[PDB]
Ligand SMILES: *[C@@H]1O[C@H](CO)[C@@H](O)[C@H](O)[C@H]1NC(C)=O
Ligand SMILES: *[C@@H]1O[C@H](CO)[C@@H](O)[C@H](O)[C@H]1NC(C)=O
Ligand SMILES: *[C@@H]1O[C@H](CO)[C@@H](O)[C@H](O)[C@H]1NC(C)=O
Ligand SMILES: *[C@@H]1O[C@H](CO)[C@@H](O)[C@H](O)[C@H]1NC(C)=O
Ligand SMILES: *[C@@H]1O[C@H](CO)[C@@H](O)[C@H](O)[C@H]1NC(C)=O
Ligand SMILES: *[C@@H]1O[C@H](CO)[C@@H](O)[C@H](O)[C@H]1NC(C)=O
C-alpha cells in the first residue's frame with residue numbers, strides 16, 4: 001500500500017557530531033520502513049562493504065531490529081571493521097563477530113572532523129588487558145597496568161592512560177584523515193519482524 | 202608481564218605521541234620556511250623545545266628497560282635508538298656552553314660578511330655575494346683576495362670556538378661509552394647482533410681507505426687533466442709537477458669542481474645537451490616539471506604523489522611580499538604528509554633537482570608503514586643515494602628524447618658522452634678526496650692523533666697528500682680553515698657524501714642489470730622497468746628496520762660498499778683520460794713547487 005514512517009537514517013548519517021570509537025553510539029532502529037537503496041546509490045560513501053547479505057536484496061528482506069553503530073576512525077583503520085580482523089580498533093575499540101550479518105559504511109570526513117589546530121575530541125583505546133568480545137563497549141578510564149607494580153591511579157612508569165586522542169588535521173594524508181563509520185547489524189529473531197523494506201506498487 | 206612486553210607497550214605509547222609531536226614541530230618548521238616571520242620563528246622554537254624535552258623525558262623513561270632481556274630485533278633497535286643520552290649525559294653548565302657554542306658558530310657562519318680593506322662602504326655575504334665570484338671569476342688575485350679574506354675573518358673568529366667544541370664533544374662522547382666524537386659519528390654504520398651482517402665502527406675507516414685506494418688512479422688522471430687545463434687558463438701560476446692552487450677550483454672550499462666545466466671542456470665545438478631553451482619554447486611550468494617527474498616514478502612502478510602533495514607543496518617562489526628559504530627541501534612531516542619546498546625555475550638543474558627531491562619523497566613514503574623511530578634510512582648514505590640515482594637516470598639523453606625535451610634527431614656520438622662524463626666526474630669524482638680527507642682529518646682531531654698546535658700543518662699536508670691541492674700562502678694556527686664550510690661549522694657528519702657516492706653507482710648497476718640495459722652504464726635509464734622499481738622498493742620499504750648490509754644485499758647482492766660500479770661508470774672517460782695524459786705527468790708532488 002501507500003507507505004509512510006521512514007526509518008530515521010537522517011539522524012545517524014547526517015549527525016552533526018559523531019562519537020569516538022571507544023564510546024561508539026548504538027541506535028536501535030525498529031518499526032519503520034528502511035529504504036537501503038538510498039544509501040547504496042549515494043555517491044558520498046567510500047566503503048559500503050556488506051558481509052553476509054547483498055545490498056540488492058536489502059530492500060526486499062525484513063528484519064526484527066537494526067543496530068546502527070556510529071564512530072570515527074582513521075583511513076587506514078577502516079579495514080579493521082570487518083569479521084576476523086586484528087588491530088587496535090578490532091582488539092581494543094570495536095570488535096565485530098565472525099558470524100556477522102550487516103554492512104559497514106564509511107566515508108571521509110576531513111571537511112567536518114579536522115581543524116587547523118588539531119581536533120583532539122576523538123579518542124581511541126590504545127591498551128586493554130584482553131581483546132573485546134563482539135559488540136562490547138568499554139568506556140572505562142582506569143590506568144592500564146603494563147608492569148608488576150601497582151599504578152595506584154597515577155600515570156607514572158609502566159602505567160599509561162588507556163585512552164589516547166586522535167589529532168585530526170586537514171593537511172593529513174588519506175590514511176590518517178578521519179572517516180565516519182556507520183555499521184548496520186541485521187538480525188532476525190523469533191519476534192515478528194517489523195523493519196521491512198519498501199514494497200513496490 | 203615480561204620486560205619485552207613492557208618495552209613493546211612503552212614503544213607503542215612513544216610511537217603514538219611522538220608522531221603527533223613530530224608533526225606539530227615539522228609543521229611549525231614548514232610554516233617558518235614558507236613564511237619567514239618572527240612569530241613563526243617563536244612558534245618553531247616553542248615546538249622544537251617541546252619536541253626536545255619530550256625526547257629527553259622519553260629517553261629517561263626508556264633507559265629503565267635493560268637491553269639484554271629483549272630478543273626481538275626491531276624492538277631492541279628502537280630501544281637502542283631511544284636510550285642514547287646524547288648531550289644529556291654531559292653536565293648542565295657544559296651542555297649550555299656547548300649549545301651556546303653551536304648557536305654562535307651558526308650565527309657567525311650565517312651572518313659572516315667580508316669585503317675588501319680600504320673599501321668598507323658595502324660588503325658581500327657568502328650566499329650569493331661570494332658564491333658568484335668564486336664560481337664565475339677568471340682573475341687570480343680577486344679569487345685569492347676573496348678566499349684569504351673569508352678564511353681570515355671566519356677562521357680567526359671560529360678557532361677558539363672549535364678548540365672548545367672538540368673538547369666538549371669528546372667529553373660528551375666518552376661519557377656515552379664511545380672512544381671519541383668520531384666514533385660517535387661512525388656509530389651510525391654499526392650493526393650488532395645479526396649473524397654475518399655485523400658491521401663495526403672500526404671497519405668503516407678501513408673500508409673507506411680500501412675504496413679510496415681504488416679511487417686514486419682515476420682521481421690522479423682527472424687531476425692531471427684539470428691541472429693542464431687550468432695551466433692553459435692561468436699561464437704561470439700552475440706548475441706541471443705540483444698541486445693545484447686552492448682558490449681556483451670553482452667553489453669556495455673545493456667541495457665540487459662543477460664550475461670548471463667551461464674551462465676544462467674537452468670538445469667545446471660540439472654542442473651541449475642543454476634542454477632549457479626547449480622547455481622555454483614549450484612553456485613548461487614547474488607544475489609540468491613535477492608532473493613529468495611523477496610520470497617517471499610511475500613508469501618505474503613506484504607510487505604516485507598524494508593529493509596532499511599537490512595541495513600543500515610550494516613549488517614556485519611566492520613573491521616579493523612573502524619570504525621563503527630558496528633551498529630545495531623534501532619534507533616528511535609525518536602522518537602521510539609529504540611536501541616539497543623548492544623555488545623551481547625553468548632550468549635543467551631545477552628539473553633534475555625536482556627528480557632528486559621527489560626521489561627523497563618516494564623514499565619517505567616507502568617506509569611510512571614502519572614504526573616512527575625506525576622511519577629513516579638504513580644509514581645516512583641511502584637517503585641521499587636514492588635521490589642521486591634519480592638524478593642520474595633523469596639526466597640521460599634517452600630520458601630527454603623519451604619525454605620529448607630533446608630532438609629525436611640529436612646525434613649521440615662519443616665526444617658528447619666524454620664531455621658529459623667529464624662534467625659528472627667534476628661533480629662526483631672530484632668531491633671524493635675532499636670528503637675523505639675532511640672526514641679523516643676530523644677523525645684524527647677527535648682521536649687526538651693531531652695536537653691543537655699542529656692542526657693546520659697536518660691539514661695542508663693531508664690536502665697536498667690526498668686532494669692534491671696546495672695552499673696559496675701558508676697559514677698559522679690562528680686560522681681555522683676547515684670550519685669555513687657549512688657542515689663542519691654546524692656539527693654535521695661528512696662521510697655521508699662519500700658513502701652516498703659509492704651507493705649511488707652500486708644502486709645504478711643493480712637497477713640497470715634489473716632493467717636489462719645492454720650498453721654503457723651512463724647511457725642507462727630505469728624508466729619503463731617494473732622489475733627495477735620492485736627491486737628498489739624492496740629496500741625502500743624496509744627503512745631502518747633492517748641492517749644496511751642486508752639492504753645492500755637486497756639491492757646489489759653485496760654485504761659491503763663497493764667501488765667497482767663507480768669505476769665502471771667512468772670507464773670510457775677513464776680510457777680517454779689515460780689517452781690524453783700520455784705527454785703530461787699523472788700524479789702530483791707534495792712540495793711547494795707551484796706557489797707558497
Ligand atoms: C545526508 O547528507 C547528504 C549530503 O548533504 C544528503 O545527500 C543525504 O540525503 C543526507 N541523508 C542521508 C540519509 O544520507
Ligand atoms: C605569511 O605571514 C603573513 C604575516 O602574518 C600573513 O599575513 C600571511 O597570511 C602568511 N601567508 C602564508 C601563505 O602563510
Ligand atoms: C617483533 O615485534 C613486532 C611488533 O612490534 C612483531 O610484529 C614481530 O613479529 C616481532 N618479531 C619477532 C622475531 O618476534
Ligand atoms: C645515560 O646516562 C645515564 C646517567 O648518566 C646512565 O645511567 C645511562 O647508562 C646512560 N645511557 C647510555 C646508553 O649510556
Ligand atoms: C595516482 O594513481 C592512481 C591510479 O594509478 C589514480 O587513481 C590517482 O588519481 C593518482 N593520484 C593523483 C593525485 O592523481
Ligand atoms: C670517437 O670515435 C671515432 C670513430 O672511431 C674516433 O675516430 C674518435 O677518436 C673517437 N673520439 C673519442 C673522444 O673517443
Ligand SMILES: *[C@@H]1O[C@H](CO)[C@@H](O)[C@H](O)[C@H]1NC(C)=O
Nearest residue numbers: 500599600603604726728729
Ligand atoms: C615509457 O612508457 C611510456 C608510456 O607509454 C611511453 O610513452 C614511453 O615512450 C616509454 N619510454 C620509452 C623509453 O620507450
